[PDB]
Each structure stands twice: as C-alpha cells, then as structure tokens.
Write an enzyme that holds these catalytic residues in place. Structure first.
Site, short mmCIF file in Angstrom:
data_model
loop_
_atom_site.label_atom_id
_atom_site.label_comp_id
_atom_site.label_asym_id
_atom_site.label_seq_id
_atom_site.Cartn_x
_atom_site.Cartn_y
_atom_site.Cartn_z
N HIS A 84 28.55 44.16 46.82
CA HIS A 84 29.79 44.88 48.06
C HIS A 84 28.96 44.06 49.16
CE1 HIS A 84 30.51 48.06 45.04
NE2 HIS A 84 31.98 47.63 46.05
N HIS A 88 32.22 39.45 47.89
CA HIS A 88 33.16 40.44 47.77
C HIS A 88 34.54 40.89 48.38
CE1 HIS A 88 35.51 43.70 45.77
NE2 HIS A 88 34.64 44.80 46.94
N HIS A 124 37.64 46.25 53.93
CA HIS A 124 37.77 46.65 53.06
C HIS A 124 35.91 47.39 52.90
CE1 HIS A 124 37.10 44.61 49.38
NE2 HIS A 124 37.16 45.70 48.48
N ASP A 125 35.15 46.85 52.62
CA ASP A 125 33.83 47.56 52.41
C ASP A 125 33.33 47.38 53.49
OD1 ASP A 125 33.96 48.61 49.10
OD2 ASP A 125 34.26 46.79 49.06
N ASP A 237 40.42 44.59 44.16
CA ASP A 237 39.19 44.60 44.10
C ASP A 237 38.44 44.60 42.87
OD1 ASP A 237 37.59 46.35 45.73
OD2 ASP A 237 38.18 47.71 45.18
C1 LIG Z 1 32.65 43.97 36.95
O1 LIG Z 1 32.74 45.45 36.03
C2 LIG Z 1 32.69 45.94 37.45
C3 LIG Z 1 33.68 45.99 38.59
C4 LIG Z 1 33.53 47.34 39.55
C5 LIG Z 1 33.37 48.79 39.31
C6 LIG Z 1 33.14 49.52 40.35
N1 LIG Z 1 33.19 50.50 39.20
N2 LIG Z 1 34.02 51.67 40.67
C7 LIG Z 1 33.87 52.93 39.60
C8 LIG Z 1 32.76 53.13 38.75
C9 LIG Z 1 32.82 54.67 37.65
C10 LIG Z 1 33.10 54.65 36.08
C11 LIG Z 1 33.85 53.68 35.62
C12 LIG Z 1 35.56 54.00 36.93
C13 LIG Z 1 35.50 53.07 38.12
C14 LIG Z 1 34.09 51.98 41.68
O2 LIG Z 1 34.20 53.21 42.05
C15 LIG Z 1 33.53 50.41 42.47
C16 LIG Z 1 34.40 50.09 43.39
C17 LIG Z 1 35.58 49.96 43.90
C18 LIG Z 1 36.29 49.08 43.00
C19 LIG Z 1 35.59 49.08 41.52
C20 LIG Z 1 34.56 49.34 41.21
C21 LIG Z 1 32.65 48.35 37.95
C22 LIG Z 1 32.41 47.55 37.12
C23 LIG Z 1 31.54 47.67 36.08
C24 LIG Z 1 30.33 47.89 35.90
C25 LIG Z 1 28.65 48.63 35.40
C26 LIG Z 1 29.38 48.42 33.64
C27 LIG Z 1 28.31 49.06 32.54
O3 LIG Z 1 29.15 49.73 31.36
N3 LIG Z 1 27.05 48.96 33.35
C28 LIG Z 1 26.03 49.18 31.92
C29 LIG Z 1 25.76 47.87 31.33
N4 LIG Z 1 24.96 47.98 31.42
O4 LIG Z 1 26.45 47.42 31.27
C30 LIG Z 1 30.86 48.14 32.93
C31 LIG Z 1 31.84 47.99 34.67
MG LIG Z 2 34.89 50.08 48.56
ZN LIG Z 3 35.92 46.40 47.53
#
Ligand SMILES: COc1ccc(C2=NN(C3CCCCCC3)C(=O)[C@@H]3CC=CC[C@H]23)cc1-c1ccc(C(=O)NCC(N)=O)cc1
Ligand SMILES: [Mg+2]
Ligand SMILES: [Zn+2]
Length: 333
Positions: A84, A88, A124-125, A237
């Site tokens: 962030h 981004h 936005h961030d 996003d």
């Molecule tokens: C490109 O991937 C992402 C893009 C955006 C976001 C975002 N999540 N959330 C939430 C996080 C909580 C639960 C899932 C729903 C989304 C956010 O509020 C972020 C801020 C705003 C938008 C999406 C972002 C997350 C990912 C992502 C990161 C890690 C993994 C993974 O499995 N971690 C382990 C590994 N060892 O691999 C997979 C995908």
């Molecule tokens: Mg944000």
């Molecule tokens: Zn963002």
C-alpha cells in the site's frame, strides 16, 4: 501541508514514458518503475498523463498545475511499505481508466463522476502503514480506540478520507476548486463514499447492493451511479488477478510480504495471527492466489460483468487464465 515547488513539478514533467501506453489493459507498471532510477516521478507522470488524456480536468476548471500539485500532495503521504504505497494507487487509477474507457463503463457515469473516480484512486489508501484495520483494533492502538469510541470500524478508510479532505482544502491542490454548489458537494461526497466502500469488511453487502440496483430498471438513478462508482473503485482495488500473469504474480508477492510483516508484529505483540499473515504457516502463492480467485475475485468480476458491465468481460477471461496457470504451477510441482 507545504505547497508543491516548481522543482518537484518539473521533475515529473520531464518524464516521457517512451514505449508505454498507459491506457492499455497490459500496461506494466513494474516495467515502468524499473525503466528509470526515479520510479516515483515516473508513477506520478503516469497519473498526470492518465488524467490529462481523459480530457476531464480541463472540463471542470482544473489547470494542469493544480492537477499535478494534487498528484504530488497525494504522493508525499504514501509510505515505504511493500504493497500500500504510491504505486498501488497509481495502478488503481490506471486500472480504473481501463475499466471506464476500454470497458465502456464511462457510458454509465457523468464526466464529473469519471473525473472523481480517477482522482479518488490516488487518495484512497493515503498514509497506509501496511497494517489492516483488524491490527489497530486487536492491539487497542490509539486509532483503533478512536474508531471504536466513534462508532466506525473502518479505521483506515476514515483516515484516508481525512487526508484527502486536507489536501483539497488548499486551492493550489484542489482538483475540484472549479466546481461549486451541487457539483462540488457531489464530488466530495462520491469520493468519500467510494473510499469508505473499499473496506473489505463491507465487500459482500456493497456487491449485493450494486447487483440489486443493476437488476432493477426502477432503481434510483443517482443511487445507481454512486454504487457504480463504488464498485469500480472496489474493482480497481482487487484487480491484481485480472492482469497478465507476471504482473499479477509480482502484486501477489508484494501483498504477501506486507501481510507477513503484519503477522510478525502481531506475534511480537502477542495478539491473534491469521494463517494468511503467518510466515511459518505457508510455502506457496499458488494455492493462495487460487483461493483468492475462487472465493473473492472470480465471483465479483463475473457478477458485475453479467449484471451490467459487459465491457469488462476481459477481466473474467484473464482471471480464468491466471487460475489455470497457477493450477499448472501445482500440477508440475
Ligand atoms: C493479489 O492478492 C491479494 C490482493 C488483495 C488482497 C486484499 N485482501 N484484503 C482481504 C484480506 C482478508 C481475507 C480475504 C479478503 C480480502 C483486503 O482487505 C486488502 C485491502 C483492500 C482490498 C483487497 C486487499 C489480498 C490478496 C492476497 C494476499 C495473500 C494471499 C495468501 O493466500 N496469503 C498466504 C500465502 N502465503 O500465499 C492471497 C491473496
Ligand atoms: Mg484501502
Ligand atoms: Zn487500495
């Protein structure tokens, strides 16, 4: 806020971005950051160019200089974190540009709304510290306490909105200073509503509201616009997985790292660490990307395309294709 100097502006304006089409769905911001040793000015110029190429700032009495002052006031408020950071929000800005103008979502919105969306991307961030809202609440940090005491759990989003408002309160960096009355109010309200809608805790209900408004030929027209703006910023996003595989992968590495850092700090503080944020609990991207694709991004993109945004079908095709490519990573491991 200290006003922007002639010299800061100049340093952006000199960047020429030879060989990049900022308007293309396969624009590669990572190739752009490498292309010079001044990656922050390049990003800034990408944003400047996107906004000028829309033709929008000119229509709303925003001079080229006030536009660039704004971009720079935004940029000074991003931090050196893995995900962030300023790249981004530039990426989100560019991505939104493509949804609006390659995906023809511009047809659903006014020009002002298009303009607001592109500006909102860059605010936005603001001042994101690489920690999610959950971190501030679990650790009873001062901003977490304030959010609980004030009755809004969107810790970070309210913060970003506060900093966007401060930048815009100086005429030198107010991209909306050419507006007045209803239009000005609309620009501020819609910008703030979109940033508040990026809190992923509200993901499901913002998606469901938009879907029900799109299916309703009698939806209130102003509400449908607002929700369309919200859904477009949300799409920006979570758009990492809609990009060419290598780009998507480098985003995934950036977020992954940032999450792990949060998890390290959560360990050192003795608060709950989710598996996702836990270094010692994962050996691979592939499964995580696929998970995110299956449970978050593919249903979101498919639903909004089918509901209304037919022009954005490419996002769904590309997600499908990235998923198959991660499946080959697994099949051959
Ligand atoms: C490109 O991937 C992402 C893009 C955006 C976001 C975002 N999540 N959330 C939430 C996080 C909580 C639960 C899932 C729903 C989304 C956010 O509020 C972020 C801020 C705003 C938008 C999406 C972002 C997350 C990912 C992502 C990161 C890690 C993994 C993974 O499995 N971690 C382990 C590994 N060892 O691999 C997979 C995908
Ligand atoms: Mg944000
Ligand atoms: Zn963002």
């Amino acid at each position: 806020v200290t006003a922007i100097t002639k010299v800061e502006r100049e340093a952006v304006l000199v960047c020429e971005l030879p060989s990049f089409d900022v308007t293309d769905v396969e624009f590669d911001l990572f190739r752009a950051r490498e292309s010079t040793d001044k990656p922050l000015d390049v990003a800034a110029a990408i944003a400047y160019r996107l906004l000028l190429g829309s033709g929008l700032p000119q229509k709303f009495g925003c001079s080229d200089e006030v536009l660039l002052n704004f971009i720079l006031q935004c940029r000074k408020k991003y931090r050196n974190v893995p995900y962030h950071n300023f790249y981004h929000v530039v990426d989100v800005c560019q991505t939104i540009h493509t949804f609006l103008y390659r995906g023809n979502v511009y047809e659903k919105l006014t020009e002002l709304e298009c303009f607001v969306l592109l500006i909102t991307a860059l605010v936005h961030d603001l001042d994101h510290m690489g920690l999610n809202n959950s971190f501030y609440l679990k650790t009873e940090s001062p901003l977490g306490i304030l959010s609980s005491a004030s009755g809004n759990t969107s810790v970070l989003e309210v913060h970003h909105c506060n900093l966007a408002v401060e930048i815009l309160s100086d005429p030198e960096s107010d991209v909306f200073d050419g507006l007045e009355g209803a239009e000005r109010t609309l620009a501020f309200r819609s910008m703030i509503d979109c940033v508040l809608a990026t809190d992923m805790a509200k993901h499901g209900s913002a998606l469901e509201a938009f879907l029900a408004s799109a299916a309703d030929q009698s939806s209130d027209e102003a509400a449908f616009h607002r929700m369309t703006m919200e859904i477009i910023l949300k799409a920006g996003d979570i758009s990492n997985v809609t990009k060419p595989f290598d780009i998507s992968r480098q985003w995934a590495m950036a977020v992954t790292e940032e999450f792990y850092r949060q998890g390290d700090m959560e360990k050192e503080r003795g608060v709950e660490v989710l598996p996702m944020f836990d270094r010692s609990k994962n050996m691979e991207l592939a499964k995580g990307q696929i998970g995110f694709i299956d449970f978050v991004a593919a249903p979101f993109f498919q639903k909004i395309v089918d509901a209304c945004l037919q022009g954005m079908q490419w996002t769904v095709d590309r997600i499908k294709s990235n998923r198959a490519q991660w499946e080959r990573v697994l099949e051959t491991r």
